[PDB]
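[Structure tokenization] protein backbone as discrete codes
[Encoding] learned vocabulary of local backbone shapes
[Protein] chain in single-letter code, fold in tokens
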Amino acid sequence: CLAEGTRIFDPVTGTTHRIEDVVDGRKPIHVVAAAKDGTLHARPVVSWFDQGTRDVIGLRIAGGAILWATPDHKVLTEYGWRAAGELRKGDRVAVRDVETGELRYSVIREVLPTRRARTFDLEVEELHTLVAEGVVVHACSP
């Protein structure tokens, strides 16, 4: 799950949303989703999950964004899919380049300890991924 405050870019409208507003309002946004070949595409959110209050860890990424996610949340990395809690400083995560909109990889500059937050998931049609704070993460069915 992803923490309250996680920013989700809608590539169709160009609007960035906080995930808790998307879920609490059942907003029919699109996200940027990754296909397995590294191409990025617009896909609609089809389900909205309130996952309750959980520990989230922080992954501070080159560029300055911090992804706050539960340790078990799957993140796309240079290795493949990995649980956020297994990632370490120096591992490289898949990101959407904010200027070009294409997929690239960025280094984790720091892993931050847990804090307690409301957490959320979205189900993204067909591709089951989304870009959250610039990072490609899992956005799957229950």
In short: DSSP finds one helix and twelve strands in the chain. The first strand starts at residue 2 and ends at 3.
